[PDB]
Amino acid sequence: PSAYIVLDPGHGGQDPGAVAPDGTREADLNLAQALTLKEYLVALGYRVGFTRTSDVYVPLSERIAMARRMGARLFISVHHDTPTASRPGVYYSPHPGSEELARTVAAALGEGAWVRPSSASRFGRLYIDDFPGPAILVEFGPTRPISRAERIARAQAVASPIAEFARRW
Ligand code: NA
Ligand SMILES: [Zn+2]
User: Fold this and answer.
1) Which of 32, 91, 133, 141 has the least CB density, counted as fewest CB within 10 Å?
2) How open is the CA angle 6-140-98, to the nearest 5 degrees?
3) Every domain of the chain and the residues it spans
4) Radius of gyration of the chain (CA)
5) How far is the CA of 61 from the centre of ligand 1 (A)?
6) Which ligand is nearest to the CA of 61?
7) Per the database entry, which stretches of residues form a coiled coil (predicted)?
8) Residue 126 φ/ψ, nearest 5 degrees
9) What percent of the residues of the chain are helix, what percent strand, and what percent coil, each to the nearest 5?
Protein backbone atom coordinates (compact mmCIF):
# COMPACT_ATOMS: atom_id res chain seq x y z
CA PRO A 1 0.00 0.00 0.00
CA SER A 2 1.56 3.34 -1.20
CA ALA A 3 -0.17 6.71 -1.73
CA TYR A 4 0.57 10.43 -1.82
CA ILE A 5 -2.89 11.48 -0.45
CA VAL A 6 -4.75 9.48 2.24
CA LEU A 7 -8.53 9.93 2.69
CA ASP A 8 -9.87 9.07 6.13
CA PRO A 9 -13.70 8.48 6.31
CA GLY A 10 -14.46 9.37 9.94
CA HIS A 11 -16.02 6.84 12.31
CA GLY A 12 -17.18 3.41 11.04
CA GLY A 13 -18.56 0.07 12.29
CA GLN A 14 -19.74 0.51 15.96
CA ASP A 15 -19.01 4.33 15.72
CA PRO A 16 -21.81 5.89 13.61
CA GLY A 17 -20.64 9.49 14.12
CA ALA A 18 -23.66 11.86 14.02
CA VAL A 19 -27.07 10.21 13.23
CA ALA A 20 -29.84 12.15 11.38
CA PRO A 21 -33.45 11.92 12.76
CA ASP A 22 -34.14 9.56 9.75
CA GLY A 23 -31.22 7.20 10.79
CA THR A 24 -28.60 8.40 8.18
CA ARG A 25 -25.17 7.64 9.78
CA GLU A 26 -22.30 10.13 9.37
CA ALA A 27 -20.00 7.02 9.05
CA ASP A 28 -21.83 6.00 5.77
CA LEU A 29 -21.85 9.57 4.34
CA ASN A 30 -18.10 9.76 5.17
CA LEU A 31 -17.18 6.53 3.29
CA ALA A 32 -19.39 7.44 0.27
CA GLN A 33 -17.94 10.99 0.11
CA ALA A 34 -14.34 9.68 0.40
CA LEU A 35 -14.90 7.02 -2.34
CA THR A 36 -16.24 9.75 -4.70
CA LEU A 37 -13.36 12.16 -3.85
CA LYS A 38 -10.77 9.38 -4.54
CA GLU A 39 -12.21 9.03 -8.13
CA TYR A 40 -11.64 12.83 -8.73
CA LEU A 41 -8.11 12.81 -7.22
CA VAL A 42 -7.11 9.73 -9.34
CA ALA A 43 -8.45 11.51 -12.51
CA LEU A 44 -6.19 14.50 -11.54
CA GLY A 45 -3.22 12.03 -11.50
CA TYR A 46 -2.70 11.31 -7.71
CA ARG A 47 -2.11 7.96 -5.90
CA VAL A 48 -4.88 7.94 -3.21
CA GLY A 49 -5.16 5.53 -0.29
CA PHE A 50 -7.79 5.08 2.43
CA THR A 51 -7.71 4.42 6.19
CA ARG A 52 -10.94 2.43 5.64
CA THR A 53 -12.97 1.16 2.67
CA SER A 54 -15.86 -0.50 4.58
CA ASP A 55 -18.14 -0.09 7.62
CA VAL A 56 -15.53 -1.16 10.21
CA TYR A 57 -14.05 1.03 13.01
CA VAL A 58 -10.32 1.83 12.55
CA PRO A 59 -8.62 3.09 15.77
CA LEU A 60 -7.60 6.76 15.50
CA SER A 61 -3.82 5.95 15.95
CA GLU A 62 -4.01 3.25 13.22
CA ARG A 63 -5.58 5.77 10.75
CA ILE A 64 -2.41 7.90 11.27
CA ALA A 65 0.02 4.91 11.31
CA MET A 66 -1.51 3.49 8.04
CA ALA A 67 -1.08 6.89 6.36
CA ARG A 68 2.61 7.05 7.43
CA ARG A 69 3.20 3.40 6.23
CA MET A 70 1.70 4.30 2.80
CA GLY A 71 4.17 7.27 2.64
CA ALA A 72 1.26 9.80 2.45
CA ARG A 73 2.23 13.51 2.27
CA LEU A 74 -1.37 14.78 2.84
CA PHE A 75 -3.99 13.45 5.31
CA ILE A 76 -7.63 14.43 4.54
CA SER A 77 -10.21 13.34 7.08
CA VAL A 78 -13.83 13.24 5.73
CA HIS A 79 -16.64 14.06 8.23
CA HIS A 80 -20.21 15.43 8.31
CA ASP A 81 -21.40 17.72 11.15
CA THR A 82 -24.38 17.31 13.56
CA PRO A 83 -27.74 17.34 11.67
CA THR A 84 -28.45 21.03 12.72
CA ALA A 85 -25.06 22.41 11.40
CA SER A 86 -25.62 25.18 8.77
CA ARG A 87 -22.06 25.67 7.44
CA PRO A 88 -19.28 23.41 6.08
CA GLY A 89 -15.70 23.89 7.28
CA VAL A 90 -12.22 22.55 7.89
CA TYR A 91 -10.19 21.85 10.99
CA TYR A 92 -6.39 22.01 10.50
CA SER A 93 -3.55 20.50 12.50
CA PRO A 94 -0.66 22.67 13.80
CA HIS A 95 1.66 20.85 11.37
CA PRO A 96 3.22 23.17 8.70
CA GLY A 97 1.02 23.48 5.59
CA SER A 98 -2.20 22.23 7.32
CA GLU A 99 -3.80 25.70 7.63
CA GLU A 100 -2.79 26.56 4.03
CA LEU A 101 -4.42 23.31 2.79
CA ALA A 102 -7.57 23.96 4.93
CA ARG A 103 -7.99 27.55 3.55
CA THR A 104 -7.66 26.42 -0.10
CA VAL A 105 -10.25 23.67 0.55
CA ALA A 106 -12.58 26.01 2.57
CA ALA A 107 -12.53 28.51 -0.43
CA ALA A 108 -14.21 25.75 -2.53
CA LEU A 109 -16.92 24.87 0.07
CA GLY A 110 -19.07 28.01 -0.68
CA GLU A 111 -20.91 30.59 1.51
CA GLY A 112 -20.23 30.62 5.26
CA ALA A 113 -17.28 28.10 5.11
CA TRP A 114 -15.07 28.29 8.27
CA VAL A 115 -11.55 27.06 9.24
CA ARG A 116 -10.50 26.27 12.84
CA PRO A 117 -7.32 24.94 14.42
CA SER A 118 -7.68 21.51 16.11
CA SER A 119 -7.13 23.48 19.39
CA ALA A 120 -10.67 25.05 18.97
CA SER A 121 -12.37 21.57 19.04
CA ARG A 122 -14.13 20.38 22.24
CA PHE A 123 -11.02 18.83 23.96
CA GLY A 124 -8.42 21.15 22.34
CA ARG A 125 -6.90 18.41 20.09
CA LEU A 126 -7.83 16.22 17.05
CA TYR A 127 -6.27 12.91 15.97
CA ILE A 128 -5.15 14.57 12.68
CA ASP A 129 -2.52 16.46 14.83
CA ASP A 130 -0.43 13.18 15.01
CA PHE A 131 0.10 13.12 11.19
CA PRO A 132 3.62 14.42 10.29
CA GLY A 133 2.40 16.36 7.23
CA PRO A 134 -0.42 18.70 6.17
CA ALA A 135 -3.55 17.25 7.79
CA ILE A 136 -7.16 18.55 7.73
CA LEU A 137 -10.62 17.35 8.81
CA VAL A 138 -13.34 18.52 6.37
CA GLU A 139 -16.89 18.85 7.82
CA PHE A 140 -18.99 18.68 4.59
CA GLY A 141 -22.08 20.20 6.27
CA PRO A 142 -24.77 18.43 8.29
CA THR A 143 -25.40 14.69 8.62
CA ARG A 144 -28.53 14.15 6.43
CA PRO A 145 -29.36 12.07 3.31
CA ILE A 146 -26.90 13.12 0.54
CA SER A 147 -27.54 12.16 -3.10
CA ARG A 148 -24.91 10.87 -5.54
CA ALA A 149 -25.06 14.21 -7.46
CA GLU A 150 -24.38 16.24 -4.26
CA ARG A 151 -21.42 13.85 -3.42
CA ILE A 152 -20.01 14.35 -6.96
CA ALA A 153 -20.46 18.18 -6.68
CA ARG A 154 -18.61 18.21 -3.32
CA ALA A 155 -15.84 15.88 -4.64
CA GLN A 156 -15.35 18.06 -7.79
CA ALA A 157 -15.32 21.24 -5.59
CA VAL A 158 -12.53 20.06 -3.18
CA ALA A 159 -10.52 17.81 -5.60
CA SER A 160 -9.01 20.76 -7.54
CA PRO A 161 -7.67 22.74 -4.49
CA ILE A 162 -6.29 19.52 -2.89
CA ALA A 163 -4.52 18.60 -6.19
CA GLU A 164 -3.21 22.21 -6.60
CA PHE A 165 -1.95 22.16 -2.92
CA ALA A 166 -0.23 18.77 -3.52
CA ARG A 167 1.40 20.09 -6.73
CA ARG A 168 2.76 23.29 -5.04
CA TRP A 169 3.61 22.18 -1.42
NA1 NA B 1 -6.47 4.96 18.63
ZN1 LIG C 1 -17.29 13.03 12.42
Assistant:
1) 32
2) 50
3) 1-169
4) 14
5) 4
6) 1
7) none
8) -130, 155
9) 40, 20, 40
